Amino acid sequence: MISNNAPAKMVLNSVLTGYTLAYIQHSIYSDYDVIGRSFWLKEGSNVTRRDFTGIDTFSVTINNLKPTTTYEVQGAFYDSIIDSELLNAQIGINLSDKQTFKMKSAPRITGARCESEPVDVGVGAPIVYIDTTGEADYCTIELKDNSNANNPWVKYYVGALMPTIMFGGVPIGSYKVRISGQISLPDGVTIDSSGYYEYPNVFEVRYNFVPPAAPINIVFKAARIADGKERYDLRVQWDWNRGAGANVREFVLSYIDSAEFVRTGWTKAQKINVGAAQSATIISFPWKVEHKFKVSSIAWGPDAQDVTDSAVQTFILNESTPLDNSFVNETGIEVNYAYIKGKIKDGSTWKQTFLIDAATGAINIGLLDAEGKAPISFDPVKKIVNVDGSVITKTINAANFVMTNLTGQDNPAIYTQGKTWGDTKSGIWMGMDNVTAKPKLDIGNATQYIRYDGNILRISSEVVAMVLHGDMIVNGTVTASKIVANNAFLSQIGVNIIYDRAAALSSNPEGSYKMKIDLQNGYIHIR
Amino acid sequence: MISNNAPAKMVLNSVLTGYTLAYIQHSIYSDYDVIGRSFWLKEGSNVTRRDFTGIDTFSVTINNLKPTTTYEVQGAFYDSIIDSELLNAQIGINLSDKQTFKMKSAPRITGARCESEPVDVGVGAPIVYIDTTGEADYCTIELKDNSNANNPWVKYYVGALMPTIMFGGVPIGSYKVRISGQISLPDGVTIDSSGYYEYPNVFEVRYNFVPPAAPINIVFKAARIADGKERYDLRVQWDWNRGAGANVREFVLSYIDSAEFVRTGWTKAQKINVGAAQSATIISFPWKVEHKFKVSSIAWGPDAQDVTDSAVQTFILNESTPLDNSFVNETGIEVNYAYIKGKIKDGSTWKQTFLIDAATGAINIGLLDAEGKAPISFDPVKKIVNVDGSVITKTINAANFVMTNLTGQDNPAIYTQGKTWGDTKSGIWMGMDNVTAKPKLDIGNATQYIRYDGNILRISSEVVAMVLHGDMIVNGTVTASKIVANNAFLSQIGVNIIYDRAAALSSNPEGSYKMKIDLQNGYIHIR
Amino acid sequence: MISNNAPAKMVLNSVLTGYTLAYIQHSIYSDYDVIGRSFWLKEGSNVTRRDFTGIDTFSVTINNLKPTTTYEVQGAFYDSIIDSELLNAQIGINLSDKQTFKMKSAPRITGARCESEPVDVGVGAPIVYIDTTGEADYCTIELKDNSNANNPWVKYYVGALMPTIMFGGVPIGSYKVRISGQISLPDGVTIDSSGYYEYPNVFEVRYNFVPPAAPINIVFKAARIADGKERYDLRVQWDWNRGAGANVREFVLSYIDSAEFVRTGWTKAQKINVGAAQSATIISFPWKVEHKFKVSSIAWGPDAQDVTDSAVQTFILNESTPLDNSFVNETGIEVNYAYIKGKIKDGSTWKQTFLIDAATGAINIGLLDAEGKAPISFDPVKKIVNVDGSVITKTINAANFVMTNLTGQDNPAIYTQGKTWGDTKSGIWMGMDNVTAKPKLDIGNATQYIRYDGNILRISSEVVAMVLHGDMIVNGTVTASKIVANNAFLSQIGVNIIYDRAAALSSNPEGSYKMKIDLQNGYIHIR
């Protein structure tokens, strides 16, 4: 009736599994003869045995646990009654009920990625999205600069595991992430770590700045003029779309002369700043000289910028298709590319005085009365110098005598307008008449006057009509109808019938005489 | 003298209170007959009893703790000596001193709020301010997209509690936060959680971009001209204030013609970019044509922008109140809106030659000598064609004979200036004199000349004065004072007293003769 | 053979050292008479002793540990067999082997610093770099606003220690950091803290915005003209470098008139916006009027901006060194700063008609035939009014008779060009000839005409040549060669030899007569 009742059945109160060790909580013992414990483990197909001599300890910590497996543990006590052999056999020794414990998996990375919002401008925070799927309580994460050969590892986040671990403040450059970890145990000193695990491939952080797209739908137009001077205004309009790249910042409008691009390309070209309205204007655009127009979509990134330009689009303003042209405000001196002129506004009669036209070289002055001419207007085309009138004239240098533009029917002459050779009026006419080819002339009326034609003259008037300043040896014939004188130193005579001035000047020349010597019929009558 | 001394008094070494369970540390036992422990709890007004059979365990973990209350716990041991009845009575059984333990409150949220700095431009980090006021050691925080019906919860921060928990990197969109938690215990396996606690109302994250305010205090001014051509320069100045909205970015100056706004509104309008100086300029502004001016305060936000405009303010430059006008640099061809002219600079005498004025239509040429006229200046107003002098004249087409502008006192005439009909000078005068209504004329001196008046003539001169080219039947009277001839074929005679040229041409016509037949007194003297 | 074998040797299973307390794990006891433990500690040169009465406890927690030292601990048990004296002596009492434990150092700060990327624009996250080098598991970090006298401390990060602790979201203003900490122990209730440790000197957070540098390498140039009107175009180019300050944002080009800066400085000055191309252009620049040009490098910071300007650089365009000048497009009215003119293009002959030059005051009209003159061109310089021809002339006001510009050798005269006094031609000549100083004249041919010289006349022609309208008292001499009449009322006579018209008019005046009374030789012949 003497026996050694074996120590009571073994129970396992609590199990806490580390990565490579499990801390197991058990019950108390008896039998006064115990030596230790004999723990059996079921790996799934193979079994192992361990021994823990010394009983003062109140819990056990198995080690050398094969990674990633659920084990079944068997508790037990043994005394000197049962030897090592029977312990191997496990008969007579009490054993625990079957309990299986899970090994917490190592910290596993499942996704690493950099991301932020599409950067518009300025400096923005780039976030780091690293995803882990293990289990621990003191996980550690480290980064290393991939660029250089040596890079003392750097640890940035230490804490509990998460499906997605995100933290900012990382530098942009190359950095690859390793993963570590530890698991705690109620026994204070013991602490189990995990093997380092680096991602197979590095990743690179960068700002989300992306070059934008160039503007499209370029359209042109212009306002014809300003008030005067024909200042032609050119406006540039275009549409820029959205959907790819970065949010474009402002623009820059660049253009150059057509004839200047050929000699040199897009250097020294005309450039102006642009607003956010997608349309800038040139207020005084050259006329008839073409131009190459380009619009640039300048972007802006946190570190620098980059520009995408539209395709070249040349255009020139001409007399075709202007709009918004209500700047024709008459000012009295209307300078235009097609003409420079001076006019005087009045009522509804735009009375114009001065003009120059670059279409026919016409030069006009003074108000118009002719169909297309004015008193002192001009026309170098089909040249003509046309003028009239002169309030003050105290001089000439050449005669201004002949009349031309018709060799025969503009008779060279200075005369009274409206009267000529053969008019009863008392007007005048002088010069070289050409309807007779020689000078005509007439001064005075048609009865008391002086007439002349190039060949001959007719002066049917007297004067007081022989006034004498010299001695005459008459080369013509001296005829007459009557004669009164004081004496006569003659040469040869004629007197048909001798009257006397005793009768001649006396009344009736056949009057009182005393002897009439008629030499015609033997007539000597003596009284 | 036989007794079972009850197990010694019970002490509670340490207490650690979880949310729903308290881990209590106790002392060791004796008496060889113990069964377990009998813990009494004082809720404040009601008591509960629990039993823990089995003594191998070294500490206890009460459960089912009513939330948010300080409990008084009573430790105890009991043996088979005292039954369940006496255990209920609690007499003879030793009891512990009175200790009260506090239950740590659940994780409580007290404030949730999004905030950052007022965004000027670019992408900025929006922070999330969530405030919790509980107590735990493994607090968890999760966000959920409020927008969609289904949103797999997301956990972002795991760590110790804090008065204010702030973490960035959250998306802008809708997100509401729940709160969880756990509390650890020295016993490894046990871990107590907390019930989920979602904020009653969601909150929405957004950038701190706010529309700015429009510019104010609009003021205009202009510089009158450029060097020449009267290029009028218009400047726009305005003041933009600060204190509300976002930090404005740049501006855009838009304006349109007055007469064009009526037909169409703020479309196809003139627009230019603006700087940060709050003032942009138009270098060649139209003259006398009004304009509607608006200045836009374009903002810029991280995702997009928005513009607040000022009120319309129309203005036109005129002859009133220009400034900074020191561009009057004479160049010799001064084109102006009020006149186009050409002048020659010299010393302090701005000698001007050419002119056209858009105030009176005046057209001027050549240097001035008259009060308001020049030799070939003009004035279509009160029209007059004024010219003088001609170095070369080889032609005319009409006579240029009459004189007008005074029908009577500008006598039609071409004559020597300074001499006329009745002057002793040897000058000339011709034409239709009108102070007598008919031609006056005089060629030569006052003694040997030819005079004429429209009616009659006076030629007091001779010629070699009867030169004869024809035969004369005299229709007047042929008088005379002396006569010399070679013969005479007469008709009737008169000879008072018969002298002879034997005496007449001979000296003393009463000289040598031989018989004088005087017919007056019977006088026949024969010698 | 009776003895009290002392309790077996003392072992120390595990040691966990707090800041001020160490939790030591030990073995179990025996001997039925124990009282407690006697722990000896080796500070390095001095020893201390402690006692722990009561054995129910299974581990010990020494306190009052001198900071920052490695201690050697000695375990022990004692029974009533050995008294306090022998316990002090430590003979007979069993003692433990020698174990030394390290005290974890307090949380030490080694570096505090604010840093971010150099801010270009917008709001950016400023990070806080605080470096700690201690050891704990619940480290705490707090910030305090240095500016104000009272600032309720704020705690922002709670977690494990790290070589460098970085967290964002801090306000910019003044903030100084303190450091705290705690260390956990397996015994649940006990928790050991650390003394507060504030950095000796505060630090201030600020954005990394820094003022940029002004632009350099300023260079000027211009395009001469537009199509017409001589619109001079001025371009401004400059280079801005990189390496210090912030990334400059855009620019602003400001300039003012030279003569206006003296009166007032850089106020009311001309200003235009600028693009990122570092070059803006003025399309119509004043000519010959200098200008002061400044280019501003406006920056942009998260809160506000700041501008650094370049040095003043004045320049004026003149006839020296323009470029890109291919805007000379003839239009027929070429307005220029040096001349305003109107010309008519044709073939390779740029036929020019109208002109005004601001170099010599020349005014030109009509096509040119002279070396430097045209029919109605002008030259107020060395003044001359030159004109010719008039298609219509119906009026004059002064004679236009005299000829001048040569007092003697431009004879005042209106005459037929190419003929004068002494030519056989039938032309004319009138006026005041000056080579004789008095009028010359001739009308008609050289045989039947009227000649005149200022003094005398020669009319070698007849008329039907004595036409009589009055009665003549001849004041000259009336000579003759022949006489025919009807009667004669004479005064005194002469008749040499009495013929008769009975013979005179009859043939042979010596013909049929009847008595010839010759008074010369006593000759009375009677028939």
Numbering used by the authors:
A (entry chain i), B (entry chain h), C (entry chain j): 1 to 464, 626 to 688
From the paper:
In siphophage T5, the unique RBP is located at the extremity of a central fiber. FhuA, an outer membrane E. coli iron-ferrichrome transporter, is the bacterial receptor recognized by T5 (25). We present the structures of T5 tail tip, determined by cryo–electron microscopy before and after interaction with its E. coli receptor, FhuA, reconstituted into nanodisc. These structures bring out the important conformational changes undergone by T5 tail tip upon infection, which include bending of T5 central fiber on the side of the tail tip, tail anchoring to the membrane, tail tube opening, and formation of a transmembrane channel.
(D) Cryo-EM structure of the central fiber at 4.2-Å resolution. BHPpb3 C-terminal ~210 residues and pb4 N-terminal ~350 residues were modeled de novo. The proximal region of the central fiber is made of three strings of five consecutive FNIIIs, two at BHPpb3 C terminus and three at pb4 N terminus. After a hinge region, the three pb4 monomers merge to form a 110-Å-long β helix spike, formed of a 24 β strand longitudinal mixed β sheet prism. The spike is decorated with two small globular domains inserted between β strands 15 and 16 of each pb4 subunit and which are connected by relatively long linkers. These domains are not visible in the central fiber map, probably because of the degrees of freedom offered by the linkers. Here, however, pb4 does not have a direct role in perforation or host recognition. The central fiber ends with RBPpb5, but this part of the map is poorly resolved and did not allow building an atomic model of this protein. This 310-Å-long central fiber bears two hinges, one between pb4 last FNIII and the spike and the other at the spike-RBPpb5 interface: It introduces some controlled flexibility to this otherwise rigid assembly and may ease RBPpb5 exploring space and encountering its bacterial receptor.
